[PDB]
């Protein structure tokens, strides 16, 4: 990366955002600017070339301009499908391609509480000698969520890992998966396994638990 | 017009990364330029180099002593060699080309530079039960565990099931191996009539698994 972009930007569907791209006189200052959209998992797709031109197939919701050593991508009529990383690109004083570090666009939506599900380890995993307990927080907003593991009422700390999806392209929510892993011997030393979820959309913490051996 | 990358998932430090891009639906000789761009994990885009119509090449100055880009007219391919790799070369590598205002891109291939070894996943079910039901909705899925390097791909019912699927970013466990889960939510009423299979492919170890996920008994 060479060009400077803000890390993230956000707005509600139907509104406008702009994404800025800061460069120097030797790149943006003297050269055309392009903009790229990258949806999670895909290659960059070009939105803008020659500062302000749209390739065929890019709707006029997307626009670009350039002034001095800066450039700007504008996106009107925001849609949930616009959730993506956006990159500006230009050429340096050697006419080699340079890119900005990217901007993540987040769509603002109403608060949504997670649905919480818990998964005991499988018998198949248990026979292989380990036990992974999975807590699922499905479709929540905003992203901030807290998961606490308790085993026989003992707070687990440093014992688990979680990860979070990218924002859903259809309803702008997130989902979170948390895994607590134990050895088989340790799994068999305890009865109650519980995941406690805290989130803005819940008026009080939600707990899902099972007793080892009820299935 | 389609571009498709092929190449090693894992490369040992100080060895040579070698990638090819197969071009369909277009003649390699007809391209204006063909090139390579990479994206290290969680970071932006970095141009590696391009080769033009004439055969002339231009490389990123910071990489140029390690890079070779060439074209195979008979295979209708072009390639990238990057010698003496280190961990810093870990990245999703994209091929790209401009044909006769908008380049074509490959799909990207993740190359990991590491002195660790390849390891295939075990695939365990995340079985649905009352503990994974909320109303008329049930959650189920597959835990894809202890594999190296990334990536794995997961689909459901050979792609026929996509609505309500969430495949999470892998996590690097303290063992040095990755673990991933993929879940789907479905009507509870379907649990006894619809089969749910998660299709798992770990291309670096050549591990493919189709694992049926059946409701528990609690």
- The CATH number that applies at residue A98 is 2.60.40.10
CA angle B15/B21/B25 to nearest 5° reads 175
Residues from chain B that touch A53, judged by Cβ atoms under 8 A, are: 101
Exp. method: X-ray
Alpha carbon separation from B146 to A16, A137, A181, B92, B120 (Å, rounded) = 43, 23, 12, 21, 7
Is A148 part of any domain? yes
Lookup result for tokens 């059946």: B214
What dihedral do alpha carbons A147, A152, A153, A157 form, nearest 10°? -50
Joined together, the tokens standing for residue A24 give 């120097």
Q: What residue numbers bound the domain in which A151 lies?
A: 115-211
CB atoms closer than 10 angstroms to residue A7: 8
Is A2 part of any domain? no
According to DSSP, the β-strands at A8-11 and A103-107 are parallel
Burial class (CB in 10 A: 0-12, 13-18, 19+), A120: buried
Buried b (16+ CB within 10 A) or exposed e, B111-120: bbbbeeebbb
Lookup result for tokens 């305890």: A190
Domain boundary among A107, A134, A164: A107
Asked if the bond preceding B139 is cis, omega within 30° of 0, the reply is no
Q: Measured between alpha carbons, how far is A28 from B175 in angstroms, rounded to an integer? A: 45
Is A162 part of any domain? yes
Kindly determine whether residue B179 and residue A132, on different chains, have CB atoms separated by under 8 Å: yes
Q: Do A102 and A123 belong to one domain?
A: no
CATH topology of domain B122-213: Immunoglobulin-like (2.60.40)
Going through chain A in order, the beta strands assigned E by DSSP cover 8-11, 17-22, 34-38, 45-48, 62-67, 70-75, 84-91, 97-99, 103-107, 115-119, 130-140, 145-151, 154-155, 160-164, 174-183, 192-199, 206-211
Is A76 part of any domain? yes
Cβ contact B104:B97 at 8 Å: yes
Chain pair A-B, CB pairs under 8 angstroms: 126
Is residue B182 within a helix (H) or strand (E), and if so which, with residue range?
Answer: strand B178-187
Alpha carbon separation from B158 to A170, B128, B197 (Å, rounded) = 22, 20, 8
B96: phi then psi, degrees, rounded to nearest 5: -150, 155
Q: Do A99 and A43 belong to one domain?
A: yes
Q: Answer positive or negative: Cα dihedral of A50, A56, A62, A63.
A: positive
Residues from chain B that touch A134, judged by Cβ atoms under 8 A, are: 126, 143, 181
Burial class (CB in 10 A: 0-12, 13-18, 19+), A205: exposed
Domain boundary among A107, A129, A146: A107
**Residue A74, strand partner residues:** A18, A63
In CATH, the number for domain B2-111 is 2.60.40.10
Joined together, the tokens standing for residue A205 give 């913490």
Lookup result for tokens 């990638």: B19
Q: Measured between alpha carbons, how far is B131 from B209 in angstroms, rounded to an integer? A: 26
Which residues contact residue A17 at a Cβ distance below 8 angstroms, ignoring those fewer than 6 apart?
Answer: A9, A10, A11, A74, A75, A78, A105
By CA distance, what is B122's nearest residue in A?
A125
Residues from chain A that touch B60, judged by Cβ atoms under 8 A, are: 96
Indicate which of A19, A35, A38, A43 best probes the interface with B, i.e. most B CBs within 10 Å of its own CB.
A43
The three-state secondary structure class of B142 is: strand
Closest to A10 in 3D by CA, of A109, A138, A87: A109
What dihedral do alpha carbons A53, A80, A83, B97 form, nearest 10°? -50
Q: Do A126 and A96 belong to one domain?
A: no
Cβ contact A89:A21 at 8 Å: no
Indicate which of B1, B131, B150, B155 best probes the interface with A, i.e. most A CBs within 10 Å of its own CB.
B131
Domain boundary among A82, A107, A132: A107
Lookup result for tokens 């309500």: B164
Q: Do A154 and A180 belong to one domain?
A: yes
What dihedral do alpha carbons A18, A23, A27, A31 form, nearest 10°? 30
- Domain coordinates in residue numbering, chain B: 2-111, 122-213
Number of domains chain A contains: 2
Q: Do A79 and A23 belong to one domain?
A: yes
By CA distance, what is B179's nearest residue in A?
A179
Joined together, the tokens standing for residue B28 give 């390699």
By CA distance, what is B178's nearest residue in A?
A161
Resolution (Å units): 2.0
Kindly determine whether residue B132 and residue A119, on different chains, have CB atoms separated by under 8 Å: yes
Closest to B79 in 3D by CA, of B5, B1, B2: B5
B102 contacts chain A (CB < 8 A): yes
CA angle B217/B211/B125 to nearest 5° reads 40
> Which residues between 133 and 172 in chain A have a beta carbon less than 8 angstroms from any beta carbon of chain B?
134, 136, 138, 161-165
Burial class (CB in 10 A: 0-12, 13-18, 19+), B87: exposed
According to DSSP, the β-strands at B153-156 and B109-113 are unpaired
DSSP secondary-structure letter at A113? P
């Amino acid at each position: 990366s060479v060009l400077t972009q803000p890390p993230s930007v956000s707005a509600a569907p139907g509104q406008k955002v702009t994404i800025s791209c800061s460069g120097s006189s030797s790149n943006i200052g003297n050269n055309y600017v392009s903009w790229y959209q990258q949806l999670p998992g895909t290659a960059p797709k070009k939105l803008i070339y020659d500062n302000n031109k749209r390739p065929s197939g890019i709707p006029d919701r997307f626009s670009g301009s350039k002034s001095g050593t800066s450039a700007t991508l504008g996106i009107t009529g925001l849609q949930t499908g616009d959730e993506a990383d956006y990159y500006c690109g230009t050429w340096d004083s050697s006419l080699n391609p340079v890119f900005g570090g990217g901007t993540k666009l987040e769509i603002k939506r109403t608060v949504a509480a997670p649905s919480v599900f818990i998964f005991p380890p499988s018998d198949e995993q248990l026979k292989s000698g380990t036990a992974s307990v999975v807590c699922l927080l499905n479709n929540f907003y905003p992203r901030e969520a807290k998961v606490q593991w308790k085993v026989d009422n003992a707070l687990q700390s440093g014992n688990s890992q979680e990860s979070v999806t990218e924002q859903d392209s259809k309803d702008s929510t997130y989902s979170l998966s948390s895994t607590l892993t134990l050895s088989k011997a340790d799994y068999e030393k305890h009865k109650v396994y519980a995941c406690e979820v805290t989130h803005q959309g819940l008026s009080s913490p939600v707990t899902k638990s099972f007793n080892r051996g009820e299935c | 017009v389609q571009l498709q990358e092929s190449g090693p998932g894992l490369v040992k430090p100080s060895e040579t990364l070698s990638l090819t891009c197969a071009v369909s639906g277009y003649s390699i000789s007809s391209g204006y330029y063909w090139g390579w761009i990479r994206q290290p994990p969680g970071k932006g885009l970095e141009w590696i180099g391009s080769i033009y119509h004439s055969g002339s090449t231009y490389y990123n100055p910071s990489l140029k002593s390690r890079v070779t880009i060439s074209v195979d007219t008979s295979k209708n391919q072009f390639s990238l060699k990057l010698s003496s790799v280190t961990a810093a070369d870990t990245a999703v590598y994209y091929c790209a080309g401009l044909t006769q205002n908008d380049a074509n891109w490959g799909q990207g291939t993740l190359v990991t530079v590491s002195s660790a070894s390849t390891k295939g996943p075990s695939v365990f079910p995340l079985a649905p039960s009352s503990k994974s039901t909320s109303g008329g909705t049930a959650a189920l899925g597959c835990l894809v565990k202890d594999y190296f390097p990334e990536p794995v791909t997961v689909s459901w019912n050979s792609g026929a099931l996509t609505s309500g699927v969430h495949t999470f970013p892998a996590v690097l466990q303290s063992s040095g191996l990755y673990s991933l889960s993929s879940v789907v939510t479905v009507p509870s009423s379907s649990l006894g009539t619809q089969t749910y299979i998660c299709n798992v492919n770990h291309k670096p170890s050549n591990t493919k698994v189709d694992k049926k996920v059946e409701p528990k008994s609690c």
